Design a binder for this molecule. Structure first.
Ligand SMILES: *[B]([O])([O])[C]([C][C]([C])[C])[N]C(=O)[C]([C]C1=[C][C]=[C][C]=[C]1)[N]C(=O)C1=[C]N=[C][C]=N1
Ligand SMILES: *[B]([O])([O])[C]([C][C]([C])[C])[N]C(=O)[C]([C]C1=[C][C]=[C][C]=[C]1)[N]C(=O)C1=[C]N=[C][C]=N1
Ligand SMILES: *[B]([O])([O])[C]([C][C]([C])[C])[N]C(=O)[C]([C]C1=[C][C]=[C][C]=[C]1)[N]C(=O)C1=[C]N=[C][C]=N1
Ligand SMILES: *[B]([O])([O])[C]([C][C]([C])[C])[N]C(=O)[C]([C]C1=[C][C]=[C][C]=[C]1)[N]C(=O)C1=[C]N=[C][C]=N1
Ligand SMILES: [Cl-]
Ligand SMILES: [Cl-]
Ligand SMILES: [Mg+2]
Ligand SMILES: [Mg+2]
Ligand SMILES: [Mg+2]
Ligand SMILES: [Mg+2]
Lengths: 195, 204, 212, 233, 226, 196, 222, 195, 196
């Protein structure tokens, strides 16, 4: 799929992901949620080749949920991101690799810190204050470089995120049919229904 | 396309009098796009330091792999691995992937705890050992680093002088490379103390 | 490369970077990417080119010949179209250039023309061209207004190039500013990015991601 | 653009104290077939220049006619054609160098590597190389094709730099050339035993030696070599 | 790379330059191209550096185990057979071009091996990008019944020819002499005709020249007691 | 490469040049292309040196193991083992091999195995790049039941021409004589065979 | 297929002083892994106190230099023996290069001399004619080895003044002709060590108001 | 992927043409008029390869304007369309053809009839009630097949045109930044500023 | 194609096969490859039939026009005209031509012009695909100043072998004798030359 964004603020992680699904000439759907909840305080958005994206996201989801049941314990965002990276790093030298780029936004309940991880299909992990995949970064990073602070509130983060989406809507050729925004904080994961 | 220059980055290592220095830039990119300015390429296992340039996923993978192997080494041997031995381990590990190699340019640096002798070594992506006396270079600005090191370097430099030499070798090489820069780190290594210094450089 | 040019109250701002590369190798950090075509017209450069050194210097000769013949300053529309009609004859022949022909005349006012090696010729208010254009557009769109002071407009152009110089690997070196009124273009300093970045970071409170 | 068909291999040459020596074997190869065994590839121009040519033989023959025509043209309205205004090596070379570069620039090259060896009016040694690309260079030793890889190393042991030229006699230089020709016969799969050798001396003039043969070859040790490793019989 | 081997009266000598290259860049100026398969069987290697090292180590390891198994000093033909069969299996993809030499109870031996697994016997051999410059010298100066002193001279002269005339070769000359009834002597940097001249200037910087952001002590020691 | 094997009254003689080439460079000018798979069964090798050596080595192993169990093998048996390798691995091999041997029962025999892997029993055989130039000569000059001296002259003259015209062929002319008397090696140097 | 281009290797270097200019270049000429010549002059005096070198493909390089020398000659004829200024020479070369835009001279051209104020001047070109005045420029095979060193030692990049810690830069003090030659020699000695196409000899042409002077230095021949 | 549309109603011809100009990754302009007035009662919209489009349109414009001055007479839409077709038919077998598709909407003052002509870069002319170039037709023709009448008013034509643009905006992946609509009738050519 | 020209005491003889092939199909089994550019200057044609005919036609035109102005041309002159066409149009031609003629002053002469366009004057010449197989035979059996009958036997035996081994060659052996006496055509059928 097309545009996925992430921004880590003071006390939460915010993930924006486009709603459009284009199969060639037509936009088949304009309300697609390009994300999966891996655990109560860990959310992974994704974008890449069709099929591979969901297949991968659900495979990861199942594995983390299996871990959660076995140990009766939620893995840290760092731990989940490392697991995910290894799966992609394993994948890239396979017969047919997973062609999937992901953002992992999680709130670490132990350290009481939000954490955003950006991992591409090669298995290239980086912890960031704000991240993106594909052409999304080319437009947004210049805005985020300017306006971003580590002590921003969630409402300030959403406003900065709106400014990013507006710039994408102005300068990107593809109509991505807006974004679904989700917030990950100490209280868990919720969706901003109006954006 | 070329795996060794997608993410970009550089590592350089030098020997001094009773000391070694290893240094790297902090850039990680997706070709033209700069992604991270905190991607450190120098890792350490005990007193043995390893810098890794090249494809970032493999940089990470190999660090995790040599951490894995040096930890088991320590449990069985009941002692920390030495630079000479680690160099051989790196070469072995890389060559076993001869026809499906990790796209990396590793650089070992450290001081032998028993003999006190300063040691550096470089490798190609499939495990060939380049055990130089003077200096080792690696990464997308290796040509530039070769040019800097070959002119700036002199033997038997004191730690605080060696720092200036390696720092200037890295900085000026990185500035003539599009895929390197965005910060830099220099490790000054002595027999029983290690100082790590972040350099202030142009952020373009 | 990052080059921009935008119309506003005080006329036109033109801002460019200074870097030239051959692959990953940085060839030059000191490149003039603004051809001062004559005292009243400016032109930018981008695209693996410098074809535009020859052709925009040539354009200056054609513009000089025009005002000798017609006893009148050439229009920005006429100047830009001489260049676009020229490159159109050479269409298919080589690589990828892109330019902004900038000027201010009495009949037109402040005018910018995006001329392109594919033959494209577009009049417009704002343009960003080069490998770092998207980064520049981000800063420019969010902060652009018609009612900008000459001081603030100059800074916005400087800041937009800095934004691209930072992210885009093939942009950087230094920023060359120009301000264009109908009385002529005015040069506003060569600004090294190495020094400009730390200056802007500290003063503006931006680039919190980077450690300094 | 073409491909070479009938080809001539190495042309080797060096300077010595009073002049230059140049040599080339008498073979015109047709791929792996050693088709023509009587081909002269050293072509003298006047009594002071010898042009040695390798590569395509049809193009060589064209160049040969151009040089022949050059001498004719130089004689026209030139009372000093056999004296002050006679053709120099430098004149003949620059002409060829002009043609070779012009032809490469029309994407229709004369598929050759040429060495113009000679002695100037003032007694100076002339030795310069030109090829299908129009690339030119001069050196105390010059060689084409395989000669570059095998002859030069041997010839450079005699004249390693400019200062060694006055110290090298014609006997020592000729010996080095003749030895180089033998080495090329051992190791070049498209060479012949028969060759021609030319000496252009500022005192004794142009000496052109035809029908020379590689001699004093070492082959006896072959009898002792058996199998490719473990075989004893 | 220039590597040569030369037979003589009572043994065999091999030699090599010390330049390693990646494209037009010199990767190592003092590379070690002479590898020890066993105490009295040494080989010189050209082509891909990792391969010549790796393939020699492997065969050398198996040769050692074989020598312990048979209670006999290893033979050159064993190293030759083991190398060629390995290289052949990989169809030239292991880029190792070797000159294998040594002394054993059978006598003194000199062989060459190519990447595809072909072997050649000879009294004088040369491999690598400078083999043509080396072979020119060998063909000009080699004779039967060479002494030890003459063979070392001829071998190092052949390497020099490559060093000077071939851009793929350079720096120093390594030699290894393996004489019958004697310990093999490995002469590292036998010749050093390429020492760099003194630089015109010292580029030692004044301390505090480099701008620094942060300093910190790195904990290399283990977790501490108390 | 110019190789040939010729049967005559007393047995068979194998003949070959000594040139190994990497393109136009002569990697080895004193190569031994006549190689031994058994006491009195030899072969001439053309094409890839690596392939023909690997093959010849394996064949010698098979015939050594054959001998240990079933006694001396026939020349036909040797040719069959060569064939089995060349035929079954035709996609990965470039080997033109002439097998030649001497029994007391069958006397001198010659089998040629070209690229395909096919076997062809003949009175005499020629192969290698340089053989093309001597088809005319060899066909005209070959007789059956020649003497040893006549057969040596036939091979010498034939390979001399093959060498003269083929760039890939050259050096010394090696020969190996296979008769009841035993195994005799012959060598002929350029100065001798060029003036013929 | 016929490939009309080739790489003859080599490396050149132009440094502009306060009242002088140097244009240095190694004398080694090569194809692939063979040396053609250990001394083949690459930097030429073109008259009017201008020195030139077109590094890369020697045939195109020799053609270009030849044509510029010719251009200087015809400039004198057509304009009453007027001295061709370095800035005018540079622009003239742009047109020579761009004149073959669609079949380029495969060379990296550098000229050096004095501007009309008497100050040192170096101009640098790409193969298709783009040019720019510079204080410092290395061109050719080993340009990537030399330029970073020159940024550091000529323009004092990344160098700051002790005690201030990054706050105050090192001042851009002018370099003498003796100081420049030291940097030139060390650049080529270093380039020779790590680049196989660089060596044999170093020829430097120094341009002052007094005229053009030559200096030659040995380089390693391996 | 530029969208240019045409519909001939009772007494006028309406041409809709996108405003977006995309040069690869960025939308450089969102107010581009992809049309030229050839004569007072003849309008030509165009879409194809960058540069070629305007170069061709202006070349045609100049020729028709030259004809108008010479004869002091306006050519019929049919005549202009035939001229244009010949130029493209000539172009297609040239060294470098014009890669331009056009719609020619004109009002014939002699016959008092609106006329819409669709001509592609090959020089393939067709007179139509409604036309389009590129992928535009794939979405719109099904709507036009259903709703179109020959006796529609100009206001009804604009409403039907809005329905076409809405469907394009829903199902096309590319954001074409809306359209500039122009009407060609007996009174000449005017632009609908609000759409 | 198997073609050859041989000088002898009384003059020169041209020889050729008669096979024209489209791949493996014999388009013409009775082709005349010996063609006349002047009274006593003929040529043997190999390679493209279309190219060699177009060339030979043009050469005959040039020599006819030469004769009208300057009298009878030399065989060297004829070879030079052939060369000029083959050399200057080497990119578009596939023609291997042997020129052979008889003067009273120069007697029998033979010039061979291979693909490149080069000229080579020789005592005898062989060319065409089938010539490869008879280099060895022809080199061994050629003598200078042979008789007419010896030269006919030399060509017959040579081409016989070339035909025997080369698929592209076959049919009848045509010959053309050029002497002071005049121009004699000879033909030799399969039954005659195969049993040799
Ligand atoms: B910019 O990056 O587009 C820049 C503009 C140019 C006028 C200086 N282009 C270049 O630097 C190009 C390479 C390139 C990089 C990225 C995108 C497109 C092109 N280089 C050159 O034009 C060049 C390189 N070396 C010498 C001279 N010119
Ligand atoms: B010699 O020039 O053949 C030399 C011998 C080697 C055993 C030290 N070869 C090399 O140095 C090779 C050349 C080569 C380049 C590229 C691909 C394969 C071979 N170099 C290396 O193996 C090499 C390259 N970079 C780093 C380390 N080693
Ligand atoms: B002969 O020329 O066929 C010869 C016989 C071989 C058994 C020694 N073969 C070669 O010389 C081959 C190349 C070749 C030449 C002509 C035809 C077919 C093949 N040479 C090699 O295999 C070779 C080349 N370089 C090094 C080692 N081996
Ligand atoms: B001979 O085989 O070269 C022959 C000589 C020709 C003058 C009659 N040539 C041909 O038969 C050629 C094909 C060819 C075969 C072998 C080598 C080179 C070329 N045949 C034709 O030109 C031909 C084929 N079909 C119809 C007409 N002509
Ligand atoms: Cl062999
Ligand atoms: Cl015919
Ligand atoms: Mg940048
Ligand atoms: Mg060398
Ligand atoms: Mg149509
Ligand atoms: Mg037949």
């Amino acid at each position: 799929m097309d545009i996925i964004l992430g921004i880590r603020v003071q006390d939460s992680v915010i993930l924006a992901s486009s709603k459009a699904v284009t199969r060639g000439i037509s936009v088949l759907k304009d309300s697609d949620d390009k994300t999966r909840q891996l655990s109560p305080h860990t959310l992974m958005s994704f974008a890449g080749e069709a099929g591979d994206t969901v297949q991968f996201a659900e495979y990861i989801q199942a594995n983390i949920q299996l871990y959660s049941i076995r140990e009766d314990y939620e893995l840290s965002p760092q731990a989940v991101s490392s697991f995910v990276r290894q799966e992609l790093a394993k994948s890239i030298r396979s017969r047919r690799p997973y062609q999937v780029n992901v953002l992992i936004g999680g709130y670490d309940k132990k350290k009481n810190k939000p954490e955003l991880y950006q991992i591409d299909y090669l298995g290239t992990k980086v912890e960031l204050p704000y991240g993106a995949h594909g052409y999304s970064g080319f437009y947004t990073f210049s805005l985020l470089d300017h306006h971003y602070r580590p002590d921003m509130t969630t409402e300030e983060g959403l406003d900065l995120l709106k400014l990013c989406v507006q710039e994408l809507e102005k300068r990107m050729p593809m109509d991505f049919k807006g974004v679904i925004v989700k917030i990950v904080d100490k209280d868990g994961i919720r969706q901003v229904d109006d954006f | 396309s070329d795996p060794s220059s997608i993410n970009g980055g550089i590592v350089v290592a030098m020997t001094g009098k009773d000391c070694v220095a290893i240094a790297c830039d902090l850039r990680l990119g997706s070709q033209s796009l700069g992604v991270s300015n905190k991607f450190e390429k120098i890792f350490h296992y005990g007193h043995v330091f390893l810098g890794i340039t090249g494809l970032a996923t493999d940089v990470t993978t190999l660090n995790e792999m040599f951490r894995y192997k040096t930890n088991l080494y320590k449990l069985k041997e009941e002692r920390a691995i030495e630079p000479e031995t680690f160099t051989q381990l790196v070469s072995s590990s890389l060559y076993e992937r001869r026809f499906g190699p990790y796209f990396v340019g590793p650089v070992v640096a450290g001081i032998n705890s028993k003999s006190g002798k300063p040691f550096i070594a470089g490798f190609d992506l499939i495990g060939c050992i380049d055990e130089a006396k003077d200096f080792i270079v690696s990464g997308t600005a290796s040509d530039q680093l070769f040019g800097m090191c070959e002119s700036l370097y002199e033997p038997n430099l004191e730690p605080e002088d060696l720092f200036e030499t390696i720092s200037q070798a890295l900085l000026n090489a990185a500035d003539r490379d599009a895929l390197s820069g965005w910060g830099a780190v220099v490790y000054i290594i002595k027999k029983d103390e290690v100082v790590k210094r972040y350099l202030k450089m142009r952020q373009d | 490369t990052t080059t921009l040019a935008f119309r506003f109250q005080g006329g036109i701002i033109v801002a460019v970077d200074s870097r030239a590369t051959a692959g990953n190798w940085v060839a030059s950090q000191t490149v003039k990417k603004v051809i001062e075509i004559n005292p009243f017209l400016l032109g930018t450069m981008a695209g693996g080119a410098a074809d535009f050194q020859f052709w925009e210097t040539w354009l200056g000769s054609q513009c000089r010949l025009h005002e000798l013949r017609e006893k009148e300053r050439i229009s920005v529309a006429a100047a830009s179209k001489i260049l676009s009609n020229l490159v159109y004859q050479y269409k298919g022949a080589g690589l990828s250039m892109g330019t902004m022909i900038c000027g201010y005349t009495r009949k037109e006012g402040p005018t910018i023309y995006y001329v392109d090696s594919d033959g494209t010729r577009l009049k417009g208010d704002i343009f960003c061209v080069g490998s770092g254009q998207t980064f520049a557009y981000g800063v420019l769109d969010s902060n652009y207004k018609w009612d900008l002071s000459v001081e603030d407009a100059l800074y916005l152009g400087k800041r937009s190039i800095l934004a691209a110089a930072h992210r885009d690997a093939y942009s950087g070196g230094s920023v060359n500013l120009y301000h264009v009124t109908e009385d002529g273009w005015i040069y506003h300093g060569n600004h090294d990015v190495g020094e400009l970045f730390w200056k802007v970071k500290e003063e503006e409170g931006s680039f919190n991601n980077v450690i300094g | 653009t073409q491909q070479p068909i009938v080809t001539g291999t190495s042309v080797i040459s060096m300077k010595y104290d009073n002049g230059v020596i140049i040599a080339a074997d008498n073979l015109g190869s047709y791929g792996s077939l050693l088709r023509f065994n009587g081909v002269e590839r050293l072509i003298p121009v006047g009594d002071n220049t010898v042009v040695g040519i390798s590569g395509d033989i049809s193009d060589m023959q064209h160049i040969e006619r151009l040089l022949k025509d050059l001498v004719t043209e130089n004689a026209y309205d030139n009372p000093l054609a056999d004296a002050e205004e006679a053709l120099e090596p430098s004149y003949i070379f620059e002409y060829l160098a002009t043609v070779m570069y012009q032809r490469r620039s029309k994407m229709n090259p004369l598929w050759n590597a040429i060495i113009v060896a000679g002695v100037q009016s003032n007694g100076d040694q002339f030795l310069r190389y030109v090829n299908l690309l129009g690339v030119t260079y001069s050196s105390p030793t010059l060689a084409t094709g395989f000669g570059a890889h095998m002859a030069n190393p041997l010839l450079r042991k005699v004249v390693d730099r400019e200062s060694d030229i006055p110290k090298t006699t014609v006997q020592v230089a000729e010996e080095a050339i003749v030895n180089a020709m033998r080495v090329l016969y051992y190791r070049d799969a498209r060479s012949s035993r028969n060759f021609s050798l030319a000496i252009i001396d500022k005192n004794t003039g142009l000496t052109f030696k035809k029908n020379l043969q590689v001699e004093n070859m070492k082959w006896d040790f072959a009898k002792d070599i058996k199998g490719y490793g473990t075989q004893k019989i | 790379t220039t590597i040569v081997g030369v037979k003589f009266n009572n043994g065999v000598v091999i030699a090599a330059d010390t330049r390693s290259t990646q494209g037009p860049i010199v990767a190592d100026k003092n590379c070690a191209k002479l590898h020890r398969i066993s105490p009295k069987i040494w080989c010189a290697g050209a082509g891909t550096a990792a391969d010549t090292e790796a393939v020699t180590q492997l065969i050398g390891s198996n040769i050692e185990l074989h020598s312990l198994y048979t209670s006999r000093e290893p033979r050159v033909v064993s190293a030759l057979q083991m190398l060629k069969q390995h290289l052949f299996k990989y169809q030239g993809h292991i880029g190792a071009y070797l000159i294998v030499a040594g002394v054993d109870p059978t006598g003194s031996h000199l062989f060459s091996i190519h990447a595809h697994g072909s072997t050649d016997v000879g009294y004088y051999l040369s491999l690598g990008s400078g083999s043509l410059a080396a072979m020119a010298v060998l063909e000009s100066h080699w004779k039967q019944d060479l002494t030890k002193e003459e063979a070392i001279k001829l071998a190092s002269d052949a390497i020099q020819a490559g060093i000077w005339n071939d851009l793929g070769s350079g720096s120093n000359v390594d030699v290894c002499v393996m004489e019958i009834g004697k310990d093999a002597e490995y002469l590292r940097n036998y010749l050093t005709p390429n020492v760099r001249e003194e630089k015109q200037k010292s580029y030692k910087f004044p301390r505090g020249t480099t701008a620094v952001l942060k300093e910190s002590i790195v904990n290399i020691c283990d977790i501490q007691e108390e | 490469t110019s190789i040939m094997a010729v049967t005559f009254k007393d047995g068979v003689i194998l003949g070959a040049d000594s040139r190994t080439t990497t393109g136009a460079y002569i990697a080895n000018r004193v190569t031994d292309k006549l190689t031994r798979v058994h006491d009195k069964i030899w072969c001439c090798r053309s094409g890839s040196a690596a392939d023909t050596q690997a093959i010849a080595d394996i064949v010698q192993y098979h015939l050594e193991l054959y001998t240990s169990q079933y006694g001396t093998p026939s020349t036909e048996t040797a040719a069959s083992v060569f064939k089995e390798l060349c035929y079954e691995n035709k996609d990965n091999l470039t080997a033109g091999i002439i097998v030649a041997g001497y029994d007391d029962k069958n006397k001198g025999e010659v089998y040629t195995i070209p690229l395909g892997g096919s076997v062809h029993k003949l009175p005499y055989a020629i192969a290698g790049s340089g053989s093309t130039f001597i088809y005319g000569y060899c066909d005209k000059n070959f007789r059956e039941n020649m003497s040893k001296e006549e057969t040596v002259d036939f091979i010498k003259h034939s390979l001399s021409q093959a060498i003269k015209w083929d760039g890939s062929s050259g050096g010394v002319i090696r020969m190996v004589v296979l008769t009841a008397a035993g195994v005799e090696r012959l060598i002929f140097y350029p100065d001798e065979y060029e003036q013929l | 297929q016929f490939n009309p281009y080739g790489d003859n290797g080599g490396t050149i270097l132009g440094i502009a002083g306060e009242d002088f200019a140097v244009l240095a270049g190694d004398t080694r000429n090569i194809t692939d892994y063979s040396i053609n010549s250990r001394y083949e002059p690459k930097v030429f005096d073109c008259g009017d106190n201008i020195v030139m070198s077109a590094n890369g493909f020697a045939a195109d390089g020799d053609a270009l230099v030849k044509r510029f020398k010719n251009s200087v000659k015809w400039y004198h004829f057509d304009h009453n023996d007027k001295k061709l200024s370095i800035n005018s020479a540079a622009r003239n070369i742009q047109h020579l290069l761009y004149g073959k835009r669609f079949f380029p001279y495969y060379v990296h051209t550098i000229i050096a001399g004095l501007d009309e104020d008497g100050k040192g001047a170096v101009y640098s070109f790409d193969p298709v004619g783009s040019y720019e005045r510079e204080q410092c420029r290395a061109g050719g095979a080993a340009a990537s080895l030399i330029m970073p060193f020159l940024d550091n030692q000529v323009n004092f990049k990344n160098q700051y003044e002790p005690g201030t810690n990054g706050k105050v830069k090192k001042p851009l003090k002018y370099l003498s002709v003796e100081e420049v030659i030291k940097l030139v020699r060390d650049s080529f000695t270093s380039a020779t060590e790590r680049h196989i196409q660089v060596g044999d000899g170093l020829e430097i042409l120094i341009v002052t108001k007094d005229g053009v002077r030559k200096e030659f230095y040995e380089l390693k021949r391996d």
